[model samples]
Target: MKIEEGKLVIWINGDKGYNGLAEVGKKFEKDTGIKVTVEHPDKLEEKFPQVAATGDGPDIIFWAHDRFGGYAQSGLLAEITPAAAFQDKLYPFTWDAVRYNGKLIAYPIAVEALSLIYNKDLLPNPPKTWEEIPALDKELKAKGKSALMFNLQEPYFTWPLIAADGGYAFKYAAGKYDIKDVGVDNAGAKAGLTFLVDLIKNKHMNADTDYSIAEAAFNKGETAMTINGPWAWSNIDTSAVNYGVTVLPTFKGQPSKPFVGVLSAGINAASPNKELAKEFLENYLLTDEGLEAVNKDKPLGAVALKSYEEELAKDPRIAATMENAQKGEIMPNIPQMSAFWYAVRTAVINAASGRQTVDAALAAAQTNAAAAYQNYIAKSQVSTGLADITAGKTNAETKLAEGLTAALTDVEALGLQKSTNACSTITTSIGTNGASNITCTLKGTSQINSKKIEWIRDADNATNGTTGAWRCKTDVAENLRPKSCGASGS
Candidate 1:
């Protein structure tokens, strides 16, 4: 492969470790004769896609893994399979975040996750379980302090508890997410929320506390512990507070699992310097010397490369984050996951503020999240459909116009066939020939022929009715069902 020689551009967000990375860039340029530019642009996330779409952006982008799905889906990312030898040197979970649709899209650099950071002077030792917190809160309250503090309205901070039992934002299986199967309102989730509500109701923790307030309280020694990530280390270190970090205490015998975020570097699909960028990443960025240089001024939290584990362990903060990360779930990277944050935050606030019961709040969240996911799917399909039609792609306009009609016809026919067959193989169990339980709903129109047809039930005789809606995979779009089709009860 011919290497593009003029320059290799990389965009990073903010200046946390800019100086160190710039020094590394200088070394790369010196070695390869390819000028390396490390640029930190304000709002890089918002600007990168727009610039990349016009085939005019950095050759490499350094950002969090959560943004990988959008970049990959937009065709802005270049996929590369890691060399077997290189793959063996990194932590396995680090690679999870860089893969989209079963293909590696980037190289993971560092990982971070939430952990229990406590003031050693105040608490001496952290509580081992949620049951131990109430007594600790009483002692702290007498001293005009609090036992624990974290942003109550942020789902990211609270997810450990919500997911303690078996709750998840989406049902993931077989390397894919079933976006419609939102589990935020399941029994396990409600159990976790109930515990949080009890804490707020008992005045053990403040419902109004947010990130800044919690951080300030922890820094000032007004709170013994705070659930935070490695990013909080800089502020805490500056405050001259004696603190220790550890994994979150168990709640009801279940360990709390925070969401882990990985920072990675990805190559731009349109970049002419593809080979050069790959060479730099593999030869320089992945080297121990390169890692040391970039991490000199400011450590890059928990490194994804196992070769640097000893160095990372020297920092208690990063070590604790890595320990917590091992047990934590990777933040889901699918576009539909965008619906979780707002909905879960609202649910947490509603339950904590005494405005609604835990069950009710979570139930509302499930409904809201599902609706939002549907909207995202519909809009994405519409945008793609319209763009294709405008570009004069063959059959684009015709496909959009015929989408709904074809979907409705196919779904109705499938429903009738199942009804006539007495729900044979079409359903798990047999039902009365005239049973009316089988129904279909036309869920919105899109240009991608991905209009969703929800099958409500298997059949009346289905020993136990199916609990969730099933989608028909026929290629069509739009909702053409009559108003009398009534509510889908799903």
Candidate 2:
């Protein structure tokens, strides 16, 4: 069979995935007479920008979905239309993952979400819920082992707890994001994190545990169960310690939901062989043979293809992967999310290290995230008008007084679908939601504004909790504004 003769390069991290890609690359070279070079980079994120800047980057890049947004926004990626053979083959969620700014920009491959992976020798069965963990811990420790362990310093590992309490970094509405509405310091969020803090304080686990420690502890059979993702499988000595995977155990009564990241291959916009990049990914790599190469070892996670997901479900690993994947939210790929990661990581580390009280650490995280959003708002050309009022460059009250109707319009227009776009001047007593001032302003509030404000004001969802009246008004004059306009809700 005659085939195209062209050189195509793909970049990947030097992991098991790289091995799979290399194998597939060799196969493609033999069959198509194409030179498929797979480049394994130690720092793809840091190095790609430099290489791309010089117009010398690979034609195809392999990475997590989270980086797609930044790269797409930076003009480092190209929008892709999968060949008909594979265009409709991927799962909708996985397909959604490869999209940035409403454009599909990459070839979605696998879902990446963490779950409870336990050694069968140590743990006959995984805990049903987090409530069962203490008893399990006691049992395991009696045998000189641990019940549960994970990288405590990373936000991704710790987020399941926060999410169990209805906390999120950004509120999504109508397919839009309110980057300003940080839920980190809310009562529910704090309430969730309290468990982790108590675990460390009670000596059930070490405070300094990082990814390496957690993985080593688990792989060495020092721990029975761990919260980890597919990537950890490559490092495990499965022959020595029989390991089993399952959905993350429940938190309280709620299921633990970690962040789900899709691994995707993207075509570099600057690639001279853009057509070949798509052809390789969509036509060749997504085929059954290609998938076998990519899933070279145990099926790591749910693949993008529906047929593959159904077939792979027969495997315990893929079943657990899908189970956990269902519970998770796609990791937000916006550049603004960088701040959220740093904020959570810092707080978790600080609290774990005993530098600050748990609440103080969480508060610091919340404050830092809010501050980052403030910066994002200020720099946003479209959101600047509302940012000025919210940031106090213009007094929210004064603006509302001048013309409440118009002020609300501007705020709403700017905030649009964002949950945190409302401008407020509440500076008095604060509740879990941070509102406790008279005459709080909520100009440009959307459908979820009332709920977000209510949630933030009473984030703990305490019964009989008093909350500020988010009932905004068109009444402009200071006199017409309710005297108890910003009356505090408990």
TM-score of each: 0.67, 0.71
Error of 1 at 144 (Å): 2.9
Question: What is the Cα root-mean-square deviation between model 1 and the actual structure?
Answer: 15.2
Q: 1-490, model 1: which lDDT tens digit per residue?
A: 1124478888887634666778888998898788988888875764676567657779999987877887888799999777889999888878988888889999998887889999999989899887799899998999899999999977889988888886788888785787778999998899988998899999999889898899999999989999987657767877978999898988779888787778899998888888888888887887787777777755577887788866777876777887787777888777655467667987999899999999999997897677754454444333332221222212222333343232222212322332211111122111232111222222233332333322322222235643222222222333322112222322
- Per candidate, the number of residue pairs that clash is 2, 7
Best by TM-score: 2
Model 2 earns a TM-score of 0.71
Candidate 1: worst-modelled 10 consecutive residues by lDDT:
420-429
Name the candidate that leads on lDDT. 1
Off by over 4 Å in 1: 1-16, 29-51, 54-58, 201-203, 296-298, 314-319, 349-357, 371-374, 377-490
RMSD of each: 15.2, 16.2
| Candidate 2 local lDDT, 289-386, one digit each (tens) | 77777776534477787776777668777778778878978888886676687779878888877888878988877876766443432222112222
Candidate 2 Cα deviation (angstroms), residue 263: 1.0
